[PDB]
Amino acid sequence: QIRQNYSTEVEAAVNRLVNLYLRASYTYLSLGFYFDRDDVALCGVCHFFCELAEEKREGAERLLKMQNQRGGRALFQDLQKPSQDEWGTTLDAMKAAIVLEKSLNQALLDLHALGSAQADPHLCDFLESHFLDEEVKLIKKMGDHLTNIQRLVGSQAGLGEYLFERLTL
Amino acid sequence: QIRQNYSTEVEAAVNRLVNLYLRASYTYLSLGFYFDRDDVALCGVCHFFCELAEEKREGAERLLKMQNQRGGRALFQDLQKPSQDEWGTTLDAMKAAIVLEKSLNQALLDLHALGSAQADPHLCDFLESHFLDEEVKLIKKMGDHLTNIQRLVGSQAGLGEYLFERLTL
Amino acid sequence: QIRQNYSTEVEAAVNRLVNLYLRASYTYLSLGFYFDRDDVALCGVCHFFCELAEEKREGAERLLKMQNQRGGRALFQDLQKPSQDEWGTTLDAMKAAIVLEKSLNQALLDLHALGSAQADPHLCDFLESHFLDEEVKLIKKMGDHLTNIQRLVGSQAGLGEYLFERLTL
Amino acid sequence: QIRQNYSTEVEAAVNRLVNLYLRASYTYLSLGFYFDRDDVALCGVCHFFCELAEEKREGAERLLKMQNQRGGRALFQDLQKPSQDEWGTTLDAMKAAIVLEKSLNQALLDLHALGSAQADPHLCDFLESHFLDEEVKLIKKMGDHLTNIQRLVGSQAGLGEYLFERLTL
Ligand SMILES: [Au+]
Ligand SMILES: [Au+]
Ligand SMILES: [Au+]
Ligand SMILES: [Au+]
Ligand SMILES: [Au+]
Ligand SMILES: [Au+]
Ligand SMILES: [Au+]
Ligand SMILES: [Au+]
Ligand SMILES: [Au+]
Ligand SMILES: [Au+]
Ligand SMILES: [Au+]
Ligand SMILES: [Au+]
Ligand SMILES: [Au+]
Ligand SMILES: [Au+]
Ligand SMILES: [Au+]
Ligand SMILES: [Au+]
Ligand SMILES: [Au+]
Ligand SMILES: [Au+]
Ligand SMILES: [Au+]
Ligand SMILES: [Au+]
Ligand SMILES: [Au+]
Ligand SMILES: [Au+]
Ligand SMILES: [Au+]
Ligand SMILES: [Au+]
Ligand SMILES: [Au+]
Ligand SMILES: [Au+]
Ligand SMILES: [Au+]
Ligand SMILES: [Au+]
Ligand SMILES: [Au+]
Ligand SMILES: [Au+]
Ligand SMILES: [Au+]
Ligand SMILES: [Au+]
Ligand SMILES: [Au+]
Ligand SMILES: [Au+]
Ligand SMILES: [Au+]
Ligand SMILES: [Au+]
Ligand SMILES: [Au+]
Ligand SMILES: [Au+]
Ligand SMILES: [Au+]
Ligand SMILES: [Au+]
Predict the structure, then answer these.
(1) Looking at the record's lineage, which domain of life comes first (chains A, B, C, D)?
(2) Number of B–C residue contacts, CB under 8 Å
(3) Which of A38, B142, D85, D135 is 20 to 30 A (C-alpha) from C68?
């Protein structure tokens, strides 16, 4: 028995956070392939979301690895399908991405608060080292992208959307 | 005692010019971080101003080194905070930069005139070699940037501001 | 809007800590050039303080970068001139440096305490990763230097001050 | 006839400055060999003065080359023997060196003033580029050395003189 100072509440919440990361991954997969549609055709947007799908999956895998290291038991649930089948414009897609990220970030912070109430400093090191800083960086990048996309809407929206994909993504 | 042909008036004016260079450096620091804001998000503008902050600091350090070489005494004053907290558009920011540069250039020229009236040819060599030519080059570059920014304003200002940052900076 | 779990109190305190780092940087600049005076002439002491000026500036820049990442707004104040124009002996200068460092360290710890009361684990990761350990290391080094400088004072102070600069710095 | 805008007064003064540089060179030669005496035996001091002898000779040669370039006629006088046969301590020797340098520097400045009164901008470029900055640097270095030598005198003069030669020169 390896398990030590690892509460059942943390264990459960780690499994939920794994589910949220895989759901996010799945969302990004759907975002990526939407932008690869012949009638959408924004290669850079596709590559941005595909890369995020992978990062989110890796996140989940690190949580699972940590679950096992602490002697908790990974439990998997259904992955709920993404919230939309079609994601609109690059602007709409980037808004939906940042609301998704803010929800993951909130779940990370709820998990940190739970680890403080439970006195679980390994969990706290774990989240700090691999999640908190990265999520903040990602959200700042998405904010930056959103400000440039918005700046490019104005009167010529198609033009702005093309330029952004070519010169930023 | 090393001091030779170095007037108290030059000495004072060198300390003031050091203060002006560090103030300029501090202005550029504030300009750079304004453009790094998530709601401004113009990476190239940030990098242009950050680089200038550093060049201005180096300027100040060279003046200090020269002060010591002539046997004057460096005296430091408060660095006054930059003239604005938010710098508006890239156009506004580049105008404010060039007025700042013109003020440094005028201070350089007042110092040269003072060195001529005092018969201080080392000071004159010093300013010529490291300051006068560089300030002229920088101001010409900023003028060029300002003309391209203005050319890009027209009807689609957001578009122009994005393009300038991507294709020039 | 990227800002999430980032209090106005943390935001303010980050801006103040930036000011303290830049002030420290400016102090070290003045310490460095004092030791470069022809009538002081302690090259190693100059290089030690110059390097510190740079580290302190970098500190400030990292805080600013973090401010932007969390969606706070950087606000700059006057940089107050250093507490002295002439810094006495290497011993006096190293004492003044360590009191300065202890004040920065205290400000770092007040900021950590504020981040705990506000439940801001990103801020806590941030300070731990880049500031707390480094400040402790620096202070230990300065303590070591101070003990060797003091050991060298005794009867022949000029000799001790020369040796320290040649064989340690 | 190449000569253009080159006064007879500048020409004469260039020949005198050549004589001063060669005299200085000769002084340094004598300083160097004094420190190589078996009863003085300060290798680093010898190497410092030997190097200066060479720099001063090079100075003279550059002046001669410039004399010819402007179509003036080099005229050589006796080189007066150095002011002393024995140079005392490293402290005494470094004082005598800096008075010598200050005299060369004054002659450089008198020549610049003469070139301004004569409207001879080539002469002014010439002195600025190769002489003024270098003489200031050298004098600052000698001042630094003098401050460290003085710091090392105190009670144990022999010790201080040995250490300076080993750890600085
Ligand atoms: Au894709
Ligand atoms: Au793709
Ligand atoms: Au993909
Ligand atoms: Au935590
Ligand atoms: Au904890
Ligand atoms: Au914690
Ligand atoms: Au913790
Ligand atoms: Au984004
Ligand atoms: Au995006
Ligand atoms: Au990107
Ligand atoms: Au920047
Ligand atoms: Au930047
Ligand atoms: Au920067
Ligand atoms: Au001048
Ligand atoms: Au002049
Ligand atoms: Au001049
Ligand atoms: Au001149
Ligand atoms: Au510019
Ligand atoms: Au510009
Ligand atoms: Au540029
Ligand atoms: Au320094
Ligand atoms: Au230095
Ligand atoms: Au420095
Ligand atoms: Au904390
Ligand atoms: Au905390
Ligand atoms: Au904490
Ligand atoms: Au913590
Ligand atoms: Au220290
Ligand atoms: Au020290
Ligand atoms: Au050290
Ligand atoms: Au020699
Ligand atoms: Au020698
Ligand atoms: Au020799
Ligand atoms: Au001249
Ligand atoms: Au002239
Ligand atoms: Au001149
Ligand atoms: Au001139
Ligand atoms: Au010397
Ligand atoms: Au010397
Ligand atoms: Au030397």
Answers:
(1) Eukaryota
(2) 64
(3) B142
Element (H, E) at A111: helix A90-117
Rounded CA-CA distance D59/A18 in Å is 77
A148 contacts in B (CB within 8 Å)? Answer: 41, 162
Three-state secondary-structure class, residue A89? coil
B114 touches B10 (CB < 8 A): yes
Nearest of B86, B87, B89 to residue B160 by alpha carbon: B89
End-to-end CA separation in angstroms for chain A: 49
Distance CA B45, CA B101 (A): 17
State the Cα–Cα distance between residues B45 and B50, nearest whole angstrom: 9
Q: Which of C122, C3, C63 is nearest to B33 (CA)?
A: C63
Number of CB atoms found within 10 A of residue B167's CB:
11
Say if CB D123 and CB D10 are below 8 A apart: yes
Q: Are A154 and A160 in contact (CB under 8 A)?
A: yes
Give the pair of three-digit tokens for residue B22.
């560090």
Which CATH number does C1-169 carry?
1.20.1260.10
- Rounded Cα distance, B150 and B122, in Å: 41
Per this entry, what is the length of chain B?
169
Q: Say yes or no: A153 contacts chain B, CB-CB below 8 A.
A: yes
CA–centroid distance, residue B72 to ligand 4 (Å)? 55
Q: How far apart are CA A32 and CA A54, in angstroms?
A: 11
How many whole angstroms separate alpha carbon A81 and alpha carbon A26?
7
Q: Is the Cβ of B163 closer than 8 Å to some Cβ of chain A?
A: yes
Of C22, C33, C145, which is closest to residue C84 (Cα–Cα)?
A: C33
Structure tokens at C48: 């030690």
A148, A156, A167: residue with CB nearest B41: A148
Q: How far is the CA of D118 from the centre of ligand 35 (A)?
A: 7
| Structural method | X-ray
Strand partners, B79: C79
CA dist D161 and D149 (Å) reads 7
Using the CB atoms, write b or e for A30-66: b if 16+ within 10 Å: bbbebbbeeebebeebbebbbebbebbbebbebbbeb
Contact present, D107 and D15 (Cβ < 8 Å)? no
Q: Do D48 and D121 touch, CB atoms closer than 8 A?
A: no
Other beta carbons within 10 Å of D149: 23
